[PDB]
Amino acid sequence: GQPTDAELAEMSREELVKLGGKIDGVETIFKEPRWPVPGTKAEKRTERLVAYWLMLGGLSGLALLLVFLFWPWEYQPFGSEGEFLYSLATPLYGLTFGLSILSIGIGAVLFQKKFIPEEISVQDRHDGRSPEVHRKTVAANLTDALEGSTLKRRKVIGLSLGIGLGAFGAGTLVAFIGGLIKNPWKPVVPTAEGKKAVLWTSGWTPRFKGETIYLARATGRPGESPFVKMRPEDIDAGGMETVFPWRESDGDGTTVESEHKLTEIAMGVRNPVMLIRIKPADMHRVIKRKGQESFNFGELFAYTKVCSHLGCPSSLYEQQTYRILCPCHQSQFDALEFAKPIFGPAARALAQLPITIDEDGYLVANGDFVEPVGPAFWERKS
Amino acid sequence: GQPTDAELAEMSREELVKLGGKIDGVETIFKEPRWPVPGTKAEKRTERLVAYWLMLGGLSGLALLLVFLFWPWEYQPFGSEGEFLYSLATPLYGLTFGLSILSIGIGAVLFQKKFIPEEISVQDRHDGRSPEVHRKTVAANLTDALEGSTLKRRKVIGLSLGIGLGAFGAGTLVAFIGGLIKNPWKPVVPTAEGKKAVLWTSGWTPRFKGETIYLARATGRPGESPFVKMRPEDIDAGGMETVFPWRESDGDGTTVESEHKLTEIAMGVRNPVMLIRIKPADMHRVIKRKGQESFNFGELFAYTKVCSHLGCPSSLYEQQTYRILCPCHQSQFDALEFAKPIFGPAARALAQLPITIDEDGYLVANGDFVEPVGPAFWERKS
Amino acid sequence: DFAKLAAAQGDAIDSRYHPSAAVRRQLNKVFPTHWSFLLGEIALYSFIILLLTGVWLTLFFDPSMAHVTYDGVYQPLRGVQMSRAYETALDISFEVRGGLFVRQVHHWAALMFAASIMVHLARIFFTGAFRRPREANWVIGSLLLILAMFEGFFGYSLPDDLLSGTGIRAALSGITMGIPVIGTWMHWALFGGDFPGEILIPRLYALHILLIPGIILALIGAHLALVWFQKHTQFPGPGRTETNVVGVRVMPVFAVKSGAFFAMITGVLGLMGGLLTINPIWNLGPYKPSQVSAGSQPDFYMMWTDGLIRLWPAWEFYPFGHTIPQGVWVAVGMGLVFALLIAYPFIEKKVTGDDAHHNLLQRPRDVPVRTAIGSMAIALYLLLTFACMNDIIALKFHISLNATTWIGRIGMVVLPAIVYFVAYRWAISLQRSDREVLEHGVETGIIKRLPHGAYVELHQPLGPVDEHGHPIPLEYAGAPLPKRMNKLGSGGAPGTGSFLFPDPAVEHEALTEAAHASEHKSLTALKEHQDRIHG
Amino acid sequence: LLSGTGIRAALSGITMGIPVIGTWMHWALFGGDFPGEILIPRLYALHILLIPG
Amino acid sequence: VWLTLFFDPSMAHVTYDGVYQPLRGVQMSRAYETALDISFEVRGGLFVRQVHH
Ligand SMILES: CC(C)=CCC/C(C)=C/CC/C(C)=C/CC/C(C)=C/CC/C(C)=C/CC/C(C)=C/CC/C(C)=C/CC/C(C)=C/CC/C(C)=C/CC1=C(C)C(=O)c2ccccc2C1=O
Ligand SMILES: CC(C)=CCC/C(C)=C/CC/C(C)=C/CC/C(C)=C/CC/C(C)=C\CC/C(C)=C/CC/C(C)=C/CC/C(C)=C/CC/C(C)=C/CC1=C(C)C(=O)c2ccccc2C1=O
Ligand SMILES: CC(C)=CCC/C(C)=C\CC/C(C)=C/CC/C(C)=C/CC/C(C)=C/CC/C(C)=C/CC/C(C)=C/CC/C(C)=C/CC/C(C)=C\CC1=C(C)C(=O)c2ccccc2C1=O
Ligand SMILES: CCCCCCCCCCCCCCCC(=O)O[C@H](COC(=O)CCCCCCC[C@@H](C)CCCCCCCCC)COP(=O)(O)O[C@H]1[C@H](O)[C@H](O)[C@H](O)[C@@H](O)[C@@H]1O
Ligand SMILES: CCCCCCCCCCCCCCCC(=O)O[C@H](COC(=O)CCCCCCC[C@@H](C)CCCCCCCCC)COP(=O)(O)O[C@H]1[C@H](O)[C@H](O)[C@H](O)[C@@H](O)[C@@H]1O
Ligand SMILES: CCCCCCCCCCCCCCCC(=O)O[C@H](COC(=O)CCCCCCC[C@@H](C)CCCCCCCCC)COP(=O)(O)O[C@H]1[C@H](O)[C@H](O)[C@H](O)[C@@H](O)[C@@H]1O
Ligand SMILES: CCCCCCCC/C=C\CCCCCCCC(=O)OC[C@H](COP(=O)(O)OCCN)OC(=O)CCCCCCCCCCCCCCC
Ligand code: HEM
Ligand code: FES
Ligand code: FES
């Protein structure tokens, strides 16, 4: 029970380790070497095994280096000489790297499990309720700091500090978050009826009364004339086409002024619509919504693609079932009837775009959606 | 010299604090309250002072919240009612916030300096050379861990682990940095003499032999027709104009194919050139460089704007001294002589563009720079 | 019942965990109460404010060179091609409530961070706080200073601006291409191509908001942990020795005053962000290689590197078919500066022989040669900074630009020598003044002797007085000496009533003798502890 | 396409459907309507520094 | 960290004009463009992003 002032000089390594364990509350029981018998060849085999694993790690690391420095990387277009090499370029990087470090780890684990001595050291756990001396002394220190400071006697300081900190906190937090906060109902989008909110307005909202908004088909042409006017004859019974609100002013994408209006049209969340050609045989099964009875042009029905529930496009269309399916959460809308949801999470019918043909027969929206078209929100149905 | 098993119960707060200091090596000397005399009105005055500071902090924090939420913020165009309010909007935010927190801090400091008791606590410093018991026990623990592990006895493992870790580190570092490493001298920029490295080529390098590169002036028009062809008559003696390498193919910015070529022309580091008109009277002081004697078209001299030292534009042209000064590091190049540096960090002359007039009299480059034009680098002057 | 709640929470904490002893150690830790030891806290607090404002800024900043026409609110820049980085910086300035203030306080916090790091470095260097126990602390602090400088560089380079863009073009691109064997390769690796490569600002944004701040946070953690556990050094004083820390405990006084100081530093930075305009990028058009400005300076913490660029005399070497531009000279100069700064404590100990564990600071006067060297280095740094500013100095103060450049060139070898000599002699003369005070006492008003007409200053001895008038000289103990009876027990008892009106005489007397008792009690406690340490 | 569709579903629809403040949270996260020009920069900050910190 | 060294967060529209042929001339954000650059035009970038995910 003494700190060994001069005994440490002659204390051996084992004695010093035991002393350290004792000081730390750790008793090392059965710290025994793995190979007590010397000269055995099983020891040599295990040595060689761990050496082989480490050498495999090193060889695989060198392989990673050489492959990374010298391998036919870089994309190869398709069916091209070198495409096979490219396809397994990255797999080779990962294989070499992972094999190298995994082999190093396996060698380390084997060394621990085969050569490092086995110990069952047990540590004294002093958890919970520090001794009463420590507890009471900490409590005394904190209480002396509090009372000596003379607080909880200067009511004016106690209240003034609280008021000041609270006011500063509130100024600071409001001034932090206020940059982010934006009124979702600031009228910004222009419209024939004056500026309206973004949620109310879409790309189909007539900017000025009587505006022509063609149901332009989005050809995949990379950049130039991405949206092209459309005609009813283009679709055939049981056909679906994704159309967008194209204006004559939003000409082809050749100009810089254009190709920004067109990009806006393409990126409009509420812009894309699906035009469906109801089969004339099944035209008699169509039920129509209140105020949407004349929206369809003959056998053409234009429904918003944006799913009424969370706003994913409802792009999937099943003909001879007339079901507009949404891939995000498997909601089906009965296109025959007004596009009311007959399955899945969606509970509101897809908004129906009024459509018609202008002069020359090109399809044009005959108005705007009589309801907000995206997914629902608090300020809706009024 | 005992842990006070049961005396802590009757030990007072002061005794417990002294005990904690003793245990931690801290002796608190002269811990005395600031106001030993009770009932004095100086104490009340100091109380009110710190209270006033904290309340000023709180009022300023409330002012920050009120001005932030309710003030004419938002940029106001020049010379418009509300410009003054906008200009002193941000100053008011900062004033209120800073005054609030500063006043809270002043109140806290005054409380510490006037009410919190004064102490000269002295702590025993146990720095340096942990007691020999701890040192020798740590050494024994580490040495027992090393030797018991049987390392420094398995030569094959010792070397194999080193090889494996070194190879894995090599491979990993090389694979980490090879993504960043790029060849500066990969021929990428096309040229009449085949693809060449970027540093050699600028916007003035003829893409095909005999290409016409007009010294187009960059009108500040926002986006459309930014670069327009130029004529010698446009400049007058003692005049400088920043010109760019414009091609007929690089037409106005109306199209989308254009306005990317034009953006590239504008953003070319080595593209901009200064065309200076040397006065006819001072034309006799001109000294010309080897291979650049015929570069000047009469009294028109085209020198790269990029400073020969670190590549800042050297735009500060001084007439009646004919000195092209660079603002970045104050280097003057004598325009009269070949644009050699006659002051400042620069040591190489500015590259001189060969200029002439094509059909219709427009200024065009009569070739390419006979030297790399940007700032110098290792692979230069050969 | 807040007291009951606090007691129950303490018991629950001490039952789940056992932090009683550790927390008591932390609370009882004693910190010296010297003002100069708050200089590092200034830098720490500015760093904290930088983090808080940078998070807000990253919530609104978009790093990209993607060209866009502004089409914002700021009329003077409409339809002009600009990078999305510049566009979003303008959006922060104008189209976010308080974004201009947040970015201005962020930049002011960056400037204060650099300045307070410099002041803290000066404090530790001149006081000898880097000696045996703390050379590692000095080293990591030097790395921290370098990281702070470069992070400020990247930070004011983040919003692609004309000024910051031309600064980047000069420093980064030019000096990188200059480096002989790997310069162009470094340039291409960093920019992913030629200078205006379309990854520069995203890379700088990453480095500036995540990578360098992470390293700085780790190094600040190491720094503060080292200061915490290698107990803070202290100046020589009455009860202060190499094996004790005289000051105040963490809990009651030091914690309160450090928190209040942090509040006041935040207030200063907020007031600056409000009242002083910092980096008004809107005046600075978007970066274009052709557009320039006359100023073209970096922040003050890189102004010394820029001034080195300006002043170094255009010496270029041309090996066989190659070039070694003037940028490499400055690159090597910066390398030397950083190497010497990092390795000074080891250089100091190699030169002097000091391998002793030093826990008592040295007065800069008491260490002349080090004080002279530090003064010489500060003079060189100031000369370089004003050389970088020589453009505006020449413009406003009517001095020829060539004259300022050559003043810098000559003075970068003359002014360091002058300042070294002056500082060395000044330190020795401060020592001489201290010894004059020690041997003669403090000075006071003059008196004319009674019999004859001699004039004697009527000094005041600081120690025991010999049987005759002259006192026994005291031994210098490394602590400052009071050279004014002002600061001693003389003329210090104004009526304690108020500014406008008095207080009752009984109250005044009670207060004044209570203060007298308290101060003499403090003096006696310190004297007794000093006597106890050796006696 | 995949991850942006996931964002449109969850972050936009769920956020904007919340009764009292749904649209207000949506507009304050996206700097306006769903395809607001700051969403990915904000997520980049959140994902490399804020949340990992 | 490696990915941040190469990623550019932005919705700023750009035509790819990169190396991946099946997406050339298609309007895309800078975020998508630089993710494609990591995948294709940066050595080991595909591996790094894949091991990251
Ligand atoms: C590389 C290098 C240092 C080259 C030399 C150029 C240089 C700095 C010359 C000295 C500048 C001076 C002092 C000009 C005045 C004329 C002159 C030389 C008189 C003789 C000097 C002399 C020995 C006088 C004896 C008495 C004495 C010490 C007088 C000093 C007077 C002054 C100016 C003291 C203050 C020092 C000072 C601020 C110098 C200018 C330095 C800088 C970088 C100012 C920056 C600055 C500027 C430039 C603004 O325009 C501004 C506008 C609005 C708000 C803020 C600022 C602002 O902070
Ligand atoms: C004689 C004697 C007794 C000596 C004592 C021995 C001695 C030195 C003992 C101390 C031992 C040391 C120092 C050990 C290492 C400590 C260490 C690094 C620990 C790790 C720290 C850690 C946790 C993370 C790493 C943090 C980090 C980045 C540390 C290094 C800090 C340093 C020195 C940065 C230097 C940066 C630099 C300028 C490098 C040169 C490379 C060049 C030329 C790049 C090109 C370049 C660029 C890229 C610019 O931006 C620029 C901007 C403005 C002007 C010019 C330039 C410029 O030239
Ligand atoms: C428009 C807009 C967005 C505006 C807002 C601007 C913006 C974006 C951000 C800034 C806004 C904010 C949030 C401002 C307030 C910042 C803040 C938390 C201030 C706190 C200061 C304050 C209000 C004090 C009130 C007075 C009072 C009662 C003080 C005593 C109680 C307090 C608060 C104690 C705090 C103690 C403190 C500073 C702890 C810091 C923790 C850290 C990081 C390290 C601790 C530490 C320290 C402090 C050492 O000095 C030290 C020295 C040597 C070795 C080790 C250490 C060490 O570990
Ligand atoms: C206790 C604090 C008491 C204060 C309550 C604060 C809430 C009431 C707001 C009062 C101001 C409203 C009227 C005048 C203002 C107005 O009409 O703005 C509106 C938006 O109100 C704003 O200004 C910013 C709102 C402030 C953020 C508040 C943060 C939450 C608070 C309540 C929690 C912290 C308080 C402390 C308690 C927590 C303690 C911690 C435990 C709409 O903006 P908009 O018309 O679209 O323009 C946009 C510009 O605002 C926009 O800043 C700009 O950045 C643009 O993006 C722009 O488009
Ligand atoms: C001990 C390691 C021994 C290996 C030494 C490695 C250095 C020799 C490189 C050998 C490969 C060169 C020939 C084939 C390859 C070739 O021609 O590529 C060149 C560039 O070489 C590369 O590939 C990447 C270079 C590798 C980075 C090495 C990092 C430094 C090392 C030496 C330090 C770590 C080693 C451990 C020691 C430190 C231990 C820590 C204490 C140029 O690229 P480029 O033609 O422009 O195409 C670009 C594509 O490379 C580019 O990756 C791509 O991303 C594009 O951007 C593309 O444009
Ligand atoms: C980061 C952002 C954090 C948020 C901070 C900012 C939040 C600020 C919110 C307060 C701003 C003012 C609200 C504006 C918008 C608003 O909220 O609508 C009001 C609604 O008041 C009512 O009557 C509702 C009560 C009556 C029905 C009883 C319902 C009980 C429900 C709530 C119980 C379910 C709760 C379950 C919680 C589930 C939680 C899920 C996790 C009425 O409309 P109004 O104020 O006139 O606004 C007009 C627009 O309605 C108009 O469409 C437009 O055209 C404009 O004119 C606009 O001005
Ligand atoms: C802005 C300003 C520039 C920035 C300034 C910061 C850089 C560090 C400052 C100064 C370093 C030079 C100091 C002066 C060195 C003294 C030379 C000598 O003669 O050595 C005599 C000593 C005393 O010996 P002593 O038994 O006390 O007897 C009394 C005998 N008369 O010997 C020794 O131990 C030491 C022998 C060798 C020491 C080597 C020190 C330099 C190491 C390289 C680091 C770079 C140096 C850069 C220099 C600028
Ligand atoms: C640690 C020390 C730091 C320093 C010295 C520093 C320095 C700077 C400076 C001087 C600016 C210029 C501001 C302006 O021109 O208006 C800046 C910009 C910026 N900083 Fe830092 N900063 C630091 C930390 C941080 C951190 C931790 C973050 C992120 C949490 C951050 C985020 C930003 C952003 C996003 C910008 C660009 C905003 C803008 O252009 O206005 N900074 N930085
Ligand atoms: S997103 Fe369409 S059903 Fe959910
Ligand atoms: S950048 Fe032009 S002289 Fe240095």
Rg of chain C (C-alpha, Å): 29 Å
> Approximately how much helix is present in the residues of chain A?
25-40%
Helical/strand content category of chain C: mainly alpha
Give the neighbour order of strands across the main sheet of chain C.
Answer: 1-5
Quaternary form? part of a larger assembly
Overall strand count of chain A: 14
Structural class of chain A: alpha+beta
What do we call the CATH topology of the domain at 198-365 in chain A? Rieske Iron-sulfur Protein
- At CATH level 3, the topology of chain C is Cytochrome Bc1 Complex, Chain C
Q: What is the 3D form of chain C? A: globular
Radius of gyration of chain A, in Å, reads 38 Å
* Domain module count of chain C: 1
Topology of chain C as a string of helices (H) and strands (E): HHEHEEHHHHHHEEHHHHHHEEH
Strand ordering within the main sheet of chain A: 4-3-5-6-7-12
Largest sheet of chain A: 6 strands, antiparallel
**How many H/I helical runs of chain A?**
7
CATH architecture annotation name of the domain at 198-365 in chain A? 3-layer Sandwich
Catalytic activity (chain C): a quinol + 2 Fe(III)-[cytochrome c](out) = a quinone + 2 Fe(II)-[cytochrome c](out) + 2 H(+)(out)
GO molecular function, one term (chain C): oxidoreductase activity
Keywords (chain C): Cell membrane, Electron transport, Heme, Iron, Membrane, Metal-binding, Oxidoreductase, Respiratory chain, Translocase, Transmembrane, Transmembrane helix, Transport
Membrane topology (chain C): Multi-pass membrane protein
